[PDB]
């Protein structure tokens with residue numbers, strides 16, 4: 001469950017948050033494959049509650065009504081077509097699996113769901129599964145409200161209702177079997193693994209019992225005996241009884257300390273600075289590298305949900321965000337996930353965004369297609385971070401340096417730092433208020449290299465900055481603090 005199952009030499013996944021299946025399939029073919037992306041995390045593919053107040057929020061997708069593959073992203077046929085077309089070009093698909101709970105206990109009964117299935121939360125009736133009152137934890141929870149009241153009590157965190165969401169009885173074999181049926185349907189289609197949503201709210205032993213029922217990956221694309229890649233969402237920032245390490249038996253775990261601390265460093269908040277990143281990783285108290293799923297922001301914390309945190313960097317602070325993402329992709333710690341977002345009407349009212357619920361770009365609830373502008377950016381209000389040159393070219397940097405040791409570290413005692421990955425790549429950052437200009441040891445063979453942050457290599461020339469590495473591996477770097485991108489990266493495949 002720890003191996004990504006990506007094609008050899010592809011090292012990252014991109015979260016195409018709320019994108020339609022037909023758009024993802026085209027994106028695999030035209031962009032992700034030739035650019036070396038390993039895989040795509042998709043939003044929940046299972047039928048959910050259509051919530052009309054507020055209007056079609058992104059979060060309605062975390063309120064399941066059935067395991068039918070019918071959502072605003074498209075139907076079962078479109079889902080199958082996407083997975084096929086992606087695997088056929090060597091790009092994997094990872095599913096966001098919502099298995100802790102069904103919908104909110106106070107949603108009205110009826111057929112207001114993305115596939116028209118009837119459901120009755122009040123009587124616990126979900127006949128398209130089917131589930132009944134017998135399949136929920138109402139009798140097991142011991143709080144007055146039936147909802148989670150206290151994160152200091154590990155038992156109620158697992159047995160009671162997260163924010164009123166109907167809590168599935170994952171202790172019983174019937175429920176475990178219905179969930180396993182859904183996941184096996186996905187695996188046979190050609191899915192390479194799963195983000196397990198709300199993992200903190202399930203017993204690690206109940207997750208195990210469901211994963212024991214899973215098939216091996218589809219033998220047309222994957223070697224015999226391949227297991228789905230599993231990464232679990234657990235928010236463990238310290239100081240509560242549940243620990244991310246309680247989940248290592250099942251797969252990888254999301255390391256939320258990563259993006260909170262890196263955002264603080266890059267913003268230079270709290271007395272922190274880039275020279276302290278010399279021991280980034282386990283030195284900062286993070287979980288082991290071989291268990292971590294890392295990221296700068298995710299779909300929750302980029303809009304103040306989940307753990308939130310003011311330090312989080314997102315597309316909305318583009319200049320610092322590209323640097324943070326650039327550091328993450330150059331550094332060997334963890335398995336990396338890049339976010340891909342949409343814009344929404346951000347409106348603050350006593351220091352909270354009251355529009356944090358807004359769903360993807362839409363026409364009366366119908367998801368807008370991803371259009372591609374002539375300069376290769378996206379229209380219709382999709383951000384497409386994954387197509388920003390500085391991010392895409394760092395996704396390739398990580399592939400080119402895969403397996404190479406962290407070496408040749410330099411720092412000025414403040415916010416000018418540089419490091420190498422073996423003899424395959426070198427990266428230089430200026431986050432200080434003055435120019436960085438210095439001759440440094442790169443570890444690279446002699447030659448002319450294109451800086452892949454400012455430009456691209458094409459036809460034996462560069463479109464941006466060029467760096468000249470001499471016979472002893474040294475090169476001069478000059479980065480103004482006023483630079484729009486104040487970092488430089490070169491690697492073995494950017495050499496002329």
Ligand SMILES: C[C@H]1O[C@H](O[C@H]2[C@H](O)[C@@H](O)[C@@H](O[C@@H]3C(CO)=C[C@H](N[C@H]4[C@H](O)[C@@H](O)[C@@H](O[C@H]5[C@H](O)[C@@H](O)[C@@H](O)O[C@@H]5CO)O[C@@H]4C)[C@H](O)[C@H]3O)O[C@@H]2CO)[C@H](O)[C@@H](O)[C@@H]1N
Pocket residue numbers: 059060061062063098104105151163164165197198199200233235300305306307
């Ligand atoms: C009925 C309910 O509907 C709406 O709730 C929505 C939320 O606002 C959305 O954020 C979204 O939640 C998703 C989800 C549930 O499917 C789980 C994910 N993330 C969770 C995390 O798993 C939880 O543990 C919890 O995090 C807490 C930490 O564990 C604590 O340590 C501490 O830091 O507090 C945090 C915050 O409580 O909540 C996280 C968000 C998943 O990725 C989420 O996207 O969807 C739900 C369901 O629609 C309404 O917003 C709400 O008011 C209604 N009561």
Ligand SMILES: [Ca+2]
Pocket residue numbers: 100157158159160167168201202
């Ligand atoms: Ca639970």
Ligand SMILES: [Cl-]
Pocket residue numbers: 233254298
């Ligand atoms: Cl996540």
